[PDB]
User: Fold VP3 from Grass carp reovirus.
Amino acid sequence: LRWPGLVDPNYRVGTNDLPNRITLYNSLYRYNFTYPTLDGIMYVRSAT
Amino acid sequence: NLFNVARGNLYLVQTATNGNWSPMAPVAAPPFVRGGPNVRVVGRFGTIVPRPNGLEPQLIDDGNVPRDIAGDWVYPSDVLQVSVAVFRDYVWPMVKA
Assistant:
């Protein structure tokens, strides 16, 4: 009952029981975020 | 002109010739006057936007629209005073070609 994500075949991916029970084996979702720096070229308005 | 001051605009086109060459007295008609057929006027910043993956860099015109470099362009004097590093690196080699 602590491990339905490993034992139970009827486990839907992403199901918790958090108001009742801590499930010790679940479907996380790893991330690979990229962090863009901004090194653009900056311009000035002409006198015209 | 008698006091070392020339009037009129300035043309920068590649003219590889062999015969007579008179810059001060252009014997031909002056090409691409401002507002002519598909002649484009650069906006106030003189701003090249870069484009990825082999696409040509676009130039922002007076109507704030990035239009492509190859063609006839009018630059105001004051735009070219501040875009001169962008001029020399992006659209001046396109003149030499």
User: Anything to note?
Assistant: Chain B has two helices and five strands. Residues 84-96 of chain B form the longest helix (13 residues). Strands of chain B lie at 39-41, 48-49, 58-60, 66-68, 72-74. Chain B touches chain A at residues 44-47, 76, 78-79, 81-83, 86 (CB under 8 Å).
